[PDB]
Structure 1
Amino acid sequence: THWGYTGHDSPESWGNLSEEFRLCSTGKNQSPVNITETVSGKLPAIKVNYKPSMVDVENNGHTIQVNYPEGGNTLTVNGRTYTLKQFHFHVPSENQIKGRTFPMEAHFVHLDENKQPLVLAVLYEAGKTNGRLSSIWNVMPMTAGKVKLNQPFDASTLLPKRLKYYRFAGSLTTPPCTEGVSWLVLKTYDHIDQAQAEKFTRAVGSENNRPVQPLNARVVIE
């Protein structure tokens, strides 16, 4: 069922659009969030095992998505292994840090053996053109189709060597807004241009940022 960021489709209305989408408005542990009050804690370290892969690059009419047909790109945290399935973007960002919104956000979406979801988020500040993403921005389809394995990419490049993160629990930020999702947001920011963000926006057709949802009973760990 059709959903979007403006008109009658809009996020305030996602719950009304379909019975399958009802948690988008009813649910109490939704993403994204404004990270403000955090409990300081001893979080387990992230180990990143990403590598040059063949990826498929899609415009799905809501975001640009780099898909990974095959495994082998993994993240280990607290002894569990999560497989990178895909990563995509939001312009502007969805999450905030103390009210701060960033020009863009990347979401690296994983599953472990148990099928537990985990999104790892990189926030991009205003700065230099992003060299490492230009591979993707060149091949970026500007209509609802896919550019296929003619496309090597190394997602190692897109993560910092400092892997300090905020940790909370929440939802998909898109319908059907399934809860059950672990969020790690990295404290270290990468960088983009204005020209790169607008190209994304041009291609996807709109700004694809869901408003922040109350944290409610949830605690963010620093």
Structure 2
Amino acid sequence: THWGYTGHDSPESWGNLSEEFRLCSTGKNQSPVNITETVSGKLPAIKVNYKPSMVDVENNGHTIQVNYPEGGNTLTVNGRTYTLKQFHFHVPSENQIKGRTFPMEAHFVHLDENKQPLVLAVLYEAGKTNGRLSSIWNVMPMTAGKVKLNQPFDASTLLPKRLKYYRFAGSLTTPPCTEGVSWLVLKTYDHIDQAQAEKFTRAVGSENNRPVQPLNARVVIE
């Protein structure tokens, strides 16, 4: 069933579009969130194991996604290795820090051996063109369709050297809004410029950011 960010299909309505999307409205750990107060805790360090891989880029009406057919881009935290299935973008950002909304957000989506989801998010400030993201922008399908990018791609370079993060539990930010998703949101911002935001949006069709969901009982660790 169709869903989106304007009209009757918009997030306020995802629950009612079908039986499967019901959690979108009745969830109590829904993403995104606005990150206000936090608990200072001694979090486990992220280990990054990203390397050049043969990737392919997809526009599906909703977002611009880079998919990894072959495993071997992984991420280790507290003993468990999480495999990157894909990364993708939202303009503007979905999550917020202290009321604040970022020009763009990227979500690196992993599963461990046990099919336990983990999203790693990177927020982008407005600034200089993003040189590392040009490879992907330069062949971004501006209407629905999957090309297959011919230069290996190093997600390595989209992650910062400084890897402090907010930690909470949540959900898919797109239907069916499944919960039980680990969220790790990176304190070091990257950057994109005006041209890049508008181009992603041009292509996707609209702003693609679900509204911030109430934390409820959840604590964000910092």
Instruction: Give yes or no for contact 1:58–1:66 (8 Å, CA) kept in 2.
Output: yes
Deviations 1:122-160 (A, max 9, x none): 000000010000000001001110111424210000000
CA distance in 1 between partners of 2:205 and 2:31 (Å): 22
What TM-score do you get using the length of structure 1 for normalisation?
A: 0.99
* 1:76 positional shift: 0.3
CA distance in 2 between partners of 1:88 and 1:108 (Å): 7
Deviations 1:181-207 (A, max 9, x none): 000000000001011000000000110
What TM-score do you get using the length of structure 2 for normalisation?
A: 0.99
* 1:132–1:88 CA distance, 2 compared to 1 (3 A): same
* Structure 2 residue ranges without an equivalent (≥5): none
- State yes or no: 1:158 paired with 2:185: no
CA distance in 1 between partners of 2:114 and 2:53 (Å): 24
Structure 2 equivalent of residue 208 of structure 1: 208
Identity %: 100
CA RMSD of aligned residues (A): 0.6
Alignment coverage as a number of residue pairs: 222
CA distance in 1 between partners of 2:194 and 2:7 (Å): 25
Deviations 1:14-46 (A, max 9, x none): 001001000000110000000111000010000
CA distance in 1 between partners of 2:85 and 2:162 (Å): 22
The runs of 4+ residues in structure 1 deviating greater than 4 Å are: none
* Structure 1 residue ranges without an equivalent (≥5): none
